[PDB]
Design a protein around this ligand. Structure first.
Ligand SMILES: [Se]
Lengths: 168, 182, 184, 174, 184, 182, 179, 175, 175, 169
């Protein structure tokens, strides 16, 4: 019921590298913290890390075990909180992480090869950050990403993008 | 209807030869680099899902594949589709996703026996290299090689006709029926 | 009696033709993808064990398989089971796990000789592609192909009857006995 | 419990045994995910949960009876007595998961993942069975008192024997 | 040199000798291992694995060569006269090939091709037609009858009834075997 | 016309065997350390881009590579180039960037079956008595190893001729044609 | 003391089966660690003081590479055998016996042996080809086979009708009880 | 030429190319040991050893002709003209070492490092390090030098790379 | 000699070589504890212990033969002759420690640090500590000394480095 | 003598000197070690036993042997036979600090930030204890907050040492 530094420490120690990396990506609009413990502490200091906010973050990185063990909440409670309050993480960020999860290293390599004209071991989220820095992708600017996903024959992910666009 | 379970069951009924046929019939949608690691039907299905050519609300390409390799048992058992329906569906213009050229080639491969296969390989000894004419090559792989050397294509049937005419005339019947339909 | 050792011994008495027959009689329980790599009886047994159709306290399906391929020698020597017992067992309603249809097909294959198999392939020329009529194919493989094209099934015996009638009359007798018995 | 014994154990285990040991100890070091087995055993030692009996239980669960005999000078029956008389470091649930994982080959794991990815909302990700169990636990999809989804998926890939193992565990709990 | 001697002996044995040797070894080499044996050396190799053939124990090889009437090989490569074998094998308990197996072999040695045709005709309702095909010899037929437990040491009725219809010397072979095995 | 997309499509049509051939034919421009991690055609193409041997205004080396591995389908489909053009381009002195020696070697590997390959390995286990050959090697890997030991080169065909003579005479015909053209 | 050049010549001259055999034969000399490959194994033997000229000679004798003995170490069969008579062995007779049995078993025989032993071992389902030496290693890990505990292996070799290999075990036991 | 061009060059190179660049400049930047490629290029600029021609030679040595065109607007023939008309920043010895390294794969480098552990401690060089790291360690021990290549020839011969021994002998005869 | 040479040496050595140089001179700089190698060399020079022979010995022990040749124009032969004919600045004990450290790979060093955690707290052990740091920590606890090596022998034996234990035994024999 | 003060001063490194200053905070606050030792001498509190106890607490047994010609056992006997210059509380803090690695100290500092704010980058455990003492958040008779923090970083062993100290008084 109360936020403390104990909860932040538990959460930070339980997440692995990929979950931490994604959590940093999902919070880029509420920002740039170098690690997750600093990110959560800054969010707490600004009054944006109540139990519900942290539960939303754990729900987005799909650590339901941490939801149940640390915050004593279940799936339906987090979904209620989300359907009742404004979201800390936008649908755009959730969509970008989802696309990243459905891509393997060969897919990301092929995607990078096609997009280098318009702009290693880098993940999809790193590429999205780099493209945002070049103003080549944005919540209202997805045609280039959609075209590149189509050209590497990932029509399913293009469809996820089209569902997002029809959602706005 | 459990969709993934149903796809898994269908895959359990398909062996490596049926899989080779399915991959050949999918050549115009799954290129060679992605064909190479496909070693069971589920992997094939996954590629088709990524192109949105296979989902619970869209079974048409899977049904066409199973029909073209004569797995009517699977059509009836797992997809509740009879031979007549498929025929109707695939005769409506614009509904078939496997080209008549590809189907024709597959059907030729259905009619060539082992001895005729060796005679076929002998007939091609001047256009294909010997490593690609080895004893461990079936007719579909030979067709893929001929396509790679542009001695076989939708508008280049001369060498195919010349070789088949020295083997059996039913092959020529298949080719000519295809030609008259196009 | 060690269960695994007894299974191994039974397997050592079964050659590749017996294994083909056992795989055919098991078609309704082992799908084609799993059938392809089975090259000895032990692999077959493993499949039956994973479905719990073969275990130390349940030898019924193994006994039925060995009885249907007429390996009474193995039944008596390794499973201490006499022909009559099996006959009494498989006549109890609800007890046979190999369908009478599958057995019927196997029995036809026991009555078809080499030359007759060539004539069978000849009779199927307009229903089966030429590749699946090659000389290496046995009759069980042909039946599997016909089933894949749904020109052969429990309620689809016309093509089988036609071809067997042009082969021999005793084959029709086998088919007709099956057809009359299977309405019970 | 010295560091020489821990070093001996760490150097003697192969990759699969080490990965299994990390999985079997997830309920004892619930907070921390240790990156290797030397750190895991060191953490267990500092928290007072790595006596001779604890290390013997761990070696017994990864079936390294040679290490039991050579390093601790114990046989199977002595460890079984210790287990029959003392509370266990590793629960029967973890033991069952590891046993199921041994009875599955790579083709079985691929089929299982294909069926289960639909309930996990998982991405396009070779995973061992134990990796899949960890991923299912993070999603709260499997637990000692929650085995129906796993039992159903094992049944649907025709591993009726493993479904029987799960049902025997369930009845052993009630 | 033992291996060289085995190789030479194998080089002197044709396919008919090999079929006879495989039949006479039926009680020691099971069917799955019988199938890939296509030369005598392989047969000898299986016997070596069972410790039934080694440089210090040639008795089973000698008995085999004696029973298939390769006395030339016996004397040439194993230094054994016909009489010695007769002196060893007539005392009960010294033969490693059973008198029952030997008897069956002797029947096949006394049956001509036409008599084989009549034998197959006589067995039409006990064995499947495919096991009575033109490619089957009498030894294979005996193996099939054994698999169906219609032929064995305590089951000679069908063999007697069939042999009595072809020739009385066959029945004499059977009856001599039976009467000699009742003396103890 | 999207250059990178066309390169990606061409790469998608090339499997691991085609890639091994392309890597062998590029050995004189891409050294072993850079060859080792190349596991798809794009990586290969990207290295060719770093040397400026492949760019939007210079497709010559790519066309030569695709021609030498007999992928005329890719030439016509993605580069709008027919077989005759290539033939007249590569006969003009000074334009062929793949040496006749390398091409020659590749063509020998195209004519050697599996049994011929095993006898080849046996004869070269003969010439190199202090090292076991790997059991999976193809003929191109064997040629690379022979080059590493300087028992095979533009001016050192003795061992190649001997081993090929103990296998087949058409290989010697290929070798002698290469020698006479130079 | 042994040069990296000699180790490299040995390693490059051996094939996959001899390398796996060498790894198995030295399991007792370096019990604590499983070397990934032959070069690392021989380096580990140097670090442990177990790779003199005689040690390497014994290892080459065990994998029966007299060509390597002569070329690399300028020695023949008689010199290494005289050395083995007068010095303690790196490789016990038990390991020599295991390797010798494994040489006479094909993959079919090994899968048959595994099928028989699964329930003794509490083994899972492993769809990878295993040699006999890999099975010996698994059995050793379960304390089911040892120089003084050969009855289970003996029985199972008998059950797959390899009386010859069982006899090899019996001769090993008689040779041990003679000394 | 500026710090922006240096920034472009540094951003475009990968780890192996950067490490090679540091190796090739060891005889020029011997006044100091630069910790990374930024500082190396800055020092070469301040010491008058990074004109357009010098940077072009460096990019030519790592065979990044695409970078030559994109950053410096040059091709191979202009760089070869510059090299024929001006002194070379990188000696033929350094070029030779780099070429040998680029013709060695992971297994050959592993074998070479193993053979050199007879000449140095096991802790001096990790198993996975590159050929250039190995040559640097050998230079610190004065075991390889432009006029001292016999040990390297012997090790290359022992891993059956007679082609690389031939490259070394060509280099020797050229002097 | 001059301070210019001191600057050259300090600039040319890397971090591990500097750390080793500090370790090798711990018995000479007893009354001080130098924070870096510049201060160590200045202290040695002011006390008359940084002659050409002393610097040559130090560079020989940190195995920088390239620097030996470039700064002092000496190869291994001359330094070994000087060492055979003059008293040593660095004791045989320190030389033994440094050679053992340079013959250990990172896995061995990790295992050693882990085993020594049974003799000191967690704050003193760190993942990225060298063997020489561990030796210093043991010296501070009087757990190792020139005439007190049994604990180090036991730890080297427990990580199966019998060769290094033998090197220690040869050292003990030589005293 | 006064020369030995210089010897010990130069022989200790930065962390050892910082610990020495921490251990002597309860005596009537010096900025460095030379001043601490001079003040102790001025008061007649730098006997051989006093210096030996100090060197033993910073675990410089080499300095014990080289400067005072004695060993660990002699110092432990002397400590069992005489009153201590440094209290058990300071010793307890120093030992807790010596059993913590950098990540544990970072986690502890992060937890305490809710109570003491940011403070002064590379902060040691003893610096944290000093800042907590200045804010009256920890004391010999007030250790429960430190116990909570040690428990939350899963170091129950150190909480046990604290509890044994609590029972010793
Ligand atoms: Se003092």
């Amino acid at each position: 019921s109360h936020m403390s530094a104990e909860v932040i420490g538990q959460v930070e120690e339980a997440l692995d590298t990929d979950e931490k990396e994604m959590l940093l990506f999902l919070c880029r609009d509420v920002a740039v913290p170098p690690n997750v413990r600093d990110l959560l502490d800054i969010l707490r200091e600004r009054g944006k890390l109540s139990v519900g906010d942290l539960a939303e973050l754990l729900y987005r990185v799909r650590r339901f075990d941490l939801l149940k063990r640390i915050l004593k909440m279940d799936r339906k409670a987090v979904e209620t909180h989300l359907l009742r309050n404004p979201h800390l993480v936008s649908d755009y960020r959730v969509l970008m992480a989802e696309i990243g999860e459905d891509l393997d290293k060969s897919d990301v390599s092929s995607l990078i090869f096609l997009m280098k004209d318009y702009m290693k071991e880098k993940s999809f989220l790193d590429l999205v950050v780099e493209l945002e820095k070049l103003n080549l992708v944005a919540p209202d600017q997805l045609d280039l990403l959609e075209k590149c996903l189509k050209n590497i024959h990932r029509i399913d992910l293009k469809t996820k993008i089209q569902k997002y666009k029809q959602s706005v | 209807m459990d969709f993934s379970r149903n796809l898994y069951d269908i895959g359990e009924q398909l062996d490596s030869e049926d899989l080779a046929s399915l991959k050949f019939l999918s050549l115009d949608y799954i290129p060679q680099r992605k064909q190479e690691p496909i070693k069971d039907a589920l992997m094939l299905f996954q590629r088709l899902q990524e192109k949105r050519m296979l989902e619970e609300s869209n079974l048409s390409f899977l049904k066409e594949l199973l029909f073209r390799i004569n797995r009517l048992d699977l059509l009836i058992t797992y997809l509740n589709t009879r031979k007549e329906e498929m025929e109707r569906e695939l005769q409506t213009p614009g509904r078939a996703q496997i080209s008549a050229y590809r189907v024709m080639l597959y059907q030729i491969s259905e009619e060539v026996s082992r001895s005729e296969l060796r005679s076929f390989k002998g007939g091609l000894q001047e256009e294909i290299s010997k490593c690609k004419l080895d004893d461990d090559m079936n007719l579909l792989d030979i067709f893929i090689e001929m396509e790679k050397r542009v001695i076989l294509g939708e508008g280049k049937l001369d060498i195919l006709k010349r070789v088949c005419a020295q083997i059996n005339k039913s092959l020529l019947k298949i080719i000519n029926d295809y030609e008259e339909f196009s």
